Ligand binder design. Structure first.
Ligand SMILES: CC(C)(COP(=O)(O)OP(=O)(O)OC[C@H]1O[C@@H](n2cnc3c(N)ncnc32)[C@H](O)[C@@H]1OP(=O)(O)O)[C@@H](O)C(=O)NCCC(=O)NCCCC(=O)O
Ligand SMILES: CC(C)(COP(=O)(O)OP(=O)(O)OC[C@H]1O[C@@H](n2cnc3c(N)ncnc32)[C@H](O)[C@@H]1OP(=O)(O)O)[C@@H](O)C(=O)NCCC(=O)NCCCC(=O)O
Ligand SMILES: O=C([O-])CC(=O)C(=O)O
Ligand SMILES: O=C([O-])CC(=O)C(=O)O
Lengths: 435, 435
């Protein structure tokens, strides 16, 4: 009865026509200009990609198909007896643009339980990895190795006509999302619970719940945290490193497994998703140097020392946002509800009063406000997940939802190879005169 | 006496100042505009990145630090008794902008022989990979797994000041280049010469020669082919998928191993470097359907059938080039010198007379001329390297030179996070009015 693939079959042709006519009328309309500073500046400020699933406003923050986080919290189906949105529903919304029914949501949950199975070569590789190999590296290498199972790769090799690419992309997308929690849980267990097993998928539970059971957590509030975490980390428009990387790579017709693994190597950068890990490590050194209950003057000194040493303060700043990330606020609210007296949470709250002021004073950051990474691990730590080097993997699992949602659309719409022109400093000086 | 690291130490500060002042004068100067069609079109035509090592002219083809291929052939140091340029020299030129001496070239060769060593976890992983796992996937997963050895990753974790990033990037770059041929040869042997060993590095040979010895080839002309192949595939300005991917990923401070592995997943796409493999497979089906000596009319029919089936003709077309790729010409010339009567070569030559005309007739391709991939495998096949699924790995090994050369510079120059703004179709329609 419910079948997202059939729903997409109807939606594709209409969007295709809509875009066709618009481009007919406005393809040559200019939307902006390119300046020297933007080229040297990592395209900061350049409108460069079409990405359908979410759009970020610099002041208001992210919108998923037009809905803000608070709206998602309110509109998306929850677990029975739950308060947090199920990521399955968010996936539905991103892919279709429509809020799903709980019946639609449960089908996604069953579909994902049904497709979760790892091939042995992958299992063996994970099991043979050394404990000093970072969790993100183990995750990316496993996803890359799963490409032997790609249906898009196989169909492409068979010569399928380009109009059908989306269909195979959708299958690999659904299968990769289904398998991600098993890959992730397996790395968790091998590294931190050696000799134990992830167990089996219960076709009757939501994806976050099967994930937390494979991780070994029983707290019901932890399951709630997971549902929220996985929903909010899902997508952040297309120009963020991980999403842009999946987009660019997939544009060459690399399969979804290869596109997602490349994205993960981008998420593992300290200026991107690895910040979630870095925040915790900075905080632990904080509490170690200054010890648990610090004074404001002492926190400032600590912050200044980081800045003075040629390092960034993790968890603050943003390439597009210019105000406090609603994702940080949404986490703060969860903390205030569930772990209001945790000392680490209290520390994170105190830095909110300090850090922005120091950054402002330093005068370099364009956005002195906190971003999502400043508040994520604090939550995790409270529930017993103290392995900070593993935090980015969870962001990785979440991010698959948004990037894979968009990837289906890129191929449905026929987006071509992403290939901008580059320039050398010498060539550019000549183009202008020099300086 | 020779030490590239000391040479770069002097060059950095001067380039830094040069760029600083230029941006002072022209940072706000507009270099182009962005249109709707460019956003929907994979940034085709957008000047979007600064990339120093090479620049591609749409009519003339690639220039490496200002030199064309013919000039490199003529200027770069050759092996004793050789005719083809040594890739070590090309690496020197890209990194420094200056043509190296043969003494400088030999130091690079020794440096790379000295740093070539694989850690056991990597060896074990390769040895346990199934034979159905594509060679590019095995290569990318191994490079990702080598990141446990990263010096940049380690220094970053220790808190190094940002001004010194380049120094660590340079070390990981030199080490990754040194190890690449061992990773690559090991996949070659495991897959196609099961039970044999890659052997050891001879500190006295050039990098291409140690590579061909690990692959198991003795023909001296094969060694020459390898030197040319590895030099020409080295870099192709910054907006090509693989280079852009390394650039974007490295912009987040991910280490060179993670940045290069993500690039490789982009090179493995059929519209990018995998075309080299695809050309051979298309050709083999050709000769199989039509059998060895075909008539022109028959080749045309074969070509039209591919086009009519919703597929591309591999090896033809380009996102920027608008004339025949000098890299294809440079290969043709090698063929004419060394294997002029090979039937496959003859077939490739015949398609040169046919394909462009059919593409023109079809009227879709903007560039109906051949690209580098149309002539690479033909050369390989003649020397006995008939494993077409492995061809992209060789391109991968070559490409490390250009992208890693640039990566050092990106960090030396302090390029920030690559983060453009994205837009949805809906948002864009509104920005304009709609259509
Ligand atoms: C996120 C970001 C990389 C954005 O970069 P960008 O758009 O270039 O920031 P910007 O325009 O404000 O940078 C201007 C200057 O302020 C500095 N600055 C910005 N944020 C800073 C911070 N948190 N700490 C210290 N300095 C900072 C920049 O590094 C830059 O300095 P230089 O001119 O000397 O290079 C940056 O704010 C940063 O480094 N933040 C800390 C890392 C972090 O929290 N990353 C997580 C982001 C969310 C995610 O992806 O998960
Ligand atoms: C290389 C490239 C992806 C460039 O793409 P792009 O810049 O979009 O080409 P373009 O502007 O000429 O495309 C216009 C149209 O011509 C079509 N076309 C272009 N090259 C074609 C080819 N070789 N065979 C069939 N159709 C082709 C395009 O796919 C596009 O069709 P649609 O409008 O229906 O989408 C394209 O020429 C192609 O697909 N070539 C075949 C694959 C190939 O050889 N790749 C290797 C490139 C070199 C490398 O990276 O190693
Ligand atoms: O938006 C970006 O640049 C980074 C970010 O917060 C994300 O990807 O979640
Ligand atoms: O220039 C590009 O777009 C593709 C290409 O030929 C390469 O990367 O060698």
């Amino acid at each position: 009865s419910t079948n997202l693939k059939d729903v997409l079959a109807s939606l594709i042709p209409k969007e295709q026509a809509r875009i066709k006519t618009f481009r007919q009328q406005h393809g040559n309309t200019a939307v902006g200009q390119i300046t020297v500073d933007m080229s040297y500046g990592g395209m900061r400020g350049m409108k460069g990609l079409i990405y359908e699933t979410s759009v970020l406003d610099p002041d208001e923050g992210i919108r998923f198909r037009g809905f803000s986080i608070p709206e998602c919290q309110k509109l998306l189906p929850k677990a029975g007896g739950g308060e947090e949105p199920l990521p399955e529903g968010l996936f539905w919304l991103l892919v279709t643009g429509q809020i799903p029914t709980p019946e639609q949501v449960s089908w996604v949950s069953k579909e994902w339980a049904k497709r979760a199975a790892l091939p042995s070569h992958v299992v063996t590789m994970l099991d043979n990895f050394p404990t000093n190999l970072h969790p993100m590296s183990q995750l990316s290498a496993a996803i890359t190795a799963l490409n032997s199972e790609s249906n898009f790769a196989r169909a492409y090799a068979e010569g399928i006509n380009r109009t059908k690419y989306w269909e195979f992309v959708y299958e690999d997308a659904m299968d990769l999302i289904a398998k991600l929690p098993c890959v992730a849980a397996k790395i968790y267990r091998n590294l931190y619970r050696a000799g134990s097993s992830i167990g089996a998928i219960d076709s009757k539970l939501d994806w976050s719940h099967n994930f937390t059971n494979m991780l070994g957590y029983t707290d019901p509030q932890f399951t709630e945290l997971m549902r929220l975490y996985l929903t909010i980390h899902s997508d952040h428009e297309g120009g963020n490193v991980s999403a842009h990387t999946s987009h660019l790579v997939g544009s060459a017709l690399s399969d979804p497994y290869l596109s997602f693994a490349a994205a993960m190597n981008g998420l593992a950068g300290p200026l991107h998703g690895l910040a979630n890990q870095e925040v915790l490590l900075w905080l632990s050194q904080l509490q170690k140097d200054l010890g648990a209950d610090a004074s404001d003057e002492k926190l400032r000194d600590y912050i200044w020392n980081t800045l003075n040493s040629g390092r960034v303060v993790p968890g603050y700043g943003h390439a597009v946002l210019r105000k406090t990330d609603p994702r940080y606020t949404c986490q703060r609210e969860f903390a205030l509800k569930h772990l209001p007296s945790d000392p680490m949470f209290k520390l994170v709250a105190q830095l909110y009063k300090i850090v922005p002021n120091v950054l402002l004073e330093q005068g370099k950051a364009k956005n002195p406000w906190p971003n999502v990474d400043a508040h994520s691990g604090v939550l995790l730590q409270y529930y017993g997940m103290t392995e900070m080097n593993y935090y980015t993997v969870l962001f990785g699992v979440s991010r698959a939802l948004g990037v894979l949602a968009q990837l289906i659309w890129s191929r449905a719409l026929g987006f071509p190879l992403e290939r901008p022109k580059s320039m050398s400093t010498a060539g550019l000086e000549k183009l202008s005169a020099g300086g």
